[model samples]
Target chain A: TGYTVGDFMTPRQNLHVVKPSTSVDDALELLVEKKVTGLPVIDDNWTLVGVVSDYDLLALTWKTFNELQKLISKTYGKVVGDLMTPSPLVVRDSTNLEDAARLLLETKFRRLPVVDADGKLIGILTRGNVVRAALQIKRNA
Target chain B: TGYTVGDFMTPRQNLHVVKPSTSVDDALELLVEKKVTGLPVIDDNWTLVGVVSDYDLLALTWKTFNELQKLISKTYGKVVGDLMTPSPLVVRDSTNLEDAARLLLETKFRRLPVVDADGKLIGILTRGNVVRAALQIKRNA
Candidate 1:
């Protein structure tokens, strides 16, 4: 809603939190449902754990034909923790757009979870949101 | 690498391609090795058939555990043709960086296969490439 990253974040009240033991299947569907490229992994205490992206899920899709056939009798056994990028970079809602944009552009982080002092999820900041902010500033400057 | 998209394009001679029927396994490996997020799928005529991205591969990763166990009996049989987004948007090398960046920022297209008049892949362009171009332009300006 504003230039500060927190003002533009998807707040925790509307966030989807997955635990380390949560199924990657469930997280994948959540990604589509929430229309977010990545999801924050949290614990029972709602502390930030890690994050999973569609890109991270690529590990499950491609295997040698013979190798995949060998797996015909079982579903791919993997959990969110197994595929997540642990201890991902975080940001705050208090941060400004320019600084946030720089951090995002300089890294492959699709979305950085905005957390509280306790490291609990508050919201999420995505690169797309920052791009939108940049476009707005450029046009309305 | 310059302002024009073509000047920054990855030329054809060094391109890696996959046929429609090529296994997603091979494409996945190619993407990882080449450090590109997507690949162009070409036909026998070398005309572009479609494209695939790491995002598209998510379909293979998540299924209900009950459902996954059902798959254990056979390899997850899938090919590039099965997963690719057909007739993806493309850009020519003659295009300028401003236009290319606009097209990319407006869509989820990870990479646009830069093509020739014959609809053959000449090189590839990616969102990351555009971002890099923008950063460079900003620094020198």
Candidate 2:
């Protein structure tokens, strides 16, 4: 299946990204505690890296809850970066909303990363954004 | 040390509310989840009731997604009788955005319900909506 991806790809280029070095605890605290769903992982130079999600932390919670009964499961020292979805599909600033929405739908992904000319993470476009756009629907005359 | 509280109070109301008996599938998902951050509560007679979010999962199944979409496309046919909010601030339609903004900011709320002469839900106002209204950067010249 040789599908050629085009440049119509678009992502959010104004949001902030998190860091790889940051702990899962930090990401989770920011998400559930602050009531956010996603954060892009970055480096000291604010470079585009990875992403962290509430669902990921929820998985961790579920895993820890299941493993709590088994004392040996606590020995695994894997961090957030170790499990994050790395090098995810991204788009440039010029990408169109329809194309971005297509990317989300076809890929079944909830968010899209918007990168800069240097491929550094800038912002994100999520289901919330897409769903909100639907509200602009009016009865055309 | 009892002192008179300043009348600088916000006459803000809650947003659209639904009951627990309301069909999560046939109800307006986009209305609550889109364009704004939250939904206000209302009753059978269109009185203020319970608030709901998209995150609340009534049923978890692979086919539930499509069913939910179909339900929402039905234009909220099912009555949200029991899903209304029990306790919410009531606001009149004639109020200004100044008080709405202050209430949302001070109380850390995202939306306010707009009622008419009958104290029924007519429309909803959100911080984002106010911000959109405040977007006077358009070139009128």
Candidate 3:
């Protein structure tokens, strides 16, 4: 039997959620401290608003020398909302693992935010998780 | 003048190169062992050919149960050439750091294979490297 999102996801409790108002420095620090590539940004209501990754932070420096200098100078002053990829693609917890895997492949995303019925983030799914599941299935067989 | 790709890239000596003929199991293991998301696929002559990533490997399991079972069973028998994203975007060693950063942003790729003018693999550039450059510049400024 195939698996569902809830079966393999890293539950919300284990995820480190960030707020839209979180500082860029704080978000980057969080990513580094947690050793994660991306973080989910939520609003006061815990609604998924956006997502930020190391690429986004480094992309901020993709500018002319003067512009990059200014950006870096105010890096701490900037907020996650300003740097995040808004309205990131998300999956429902009830989704089949194969469908989730398909979405990941089609989108070429390293991770997908797993949401609940009310569109509240419930967990995160990544390639590693799917690989782990594949390994587990093989082991159990 | 702004920084160049060579300035911030992980030199070839430090990169983990893979051959197109390498087994999928071997490639996946290298990814796990090195804790990297992608690997540059090089030919016998050390010429860049493609790039393989965790997403590509996991995507293999996004099929019907029967297909997935067969894939997992032969995972070790298949080669990287069957799983790699061929003709991946690459940058020259002399490319401006800003341009490389822009490329990463545009493609949403975590890393870019850096090559020499002769099209020989020379190094790897990544978002982390760019962030480090930003931090270094901030400190020096």
- Those runs of model 3 whose alpha carbons end farther than 4 Å from true positions after fitting are A1-23, A26-35, A39-71, A78-126, B58-76, B105-110
Candidate achieving higher lDDT, 2 or 3: 3
lDDT of 2 at B77: 38
Q: Summing lDDT over every window of 10 consecutive residues in candidate 3 chain B, give the lowest-scoring window.
A: B60-69
Off by over 4 Å in 1: A1-3, A61-75, A138-140, B1-141
Please, what are the lDDT tens digits per residue for candidate 2 over residues A9-59? 223344545676665545544543333566777778766677766555445
DockQ for every model comes to 0.02, 0.04, 0.15
Winner on DockQ (1 vs 2): 2
Q: What is residue A96's positional error in candidate 3, in angstroms? A: 14
TM-score preference between candidates 1 and 3, better one: 3
RMSD of each: 20.5, 13.3, 6.1
Estimate the overall C-alpha local distance difference test score of candidate 1: 0.64
Q: What lDDT tens digits, residue by residue, belong to model 3 across residues B36-136?
A: 77889999988998888867764643443345556666675678898887788899878998888777765534678998877789988876666656666
Candidate 3 residue-wise lDDT, A65-125, digit = tens: 4455566677867888887888888998888888887676654346789988888888988
In order, the Cα lDDT scores of the candidates are 0.64, 0.48, 0.75
| Interface RMSD, Å, model 3 | 4.4
Candidate 2 on B33-128: residue-level lDDT in tens? 432344665656876565555533222211222343343344333444433335555455566555554455443344566666787676665433
* Deviation (Å) of B10 in candidate 2: 20
Each candidate's interface RMSD, rounded to one decimal?
23.1, 16.2, 4.4
The CAPRI quality class of candidate 2 comes to incorrect
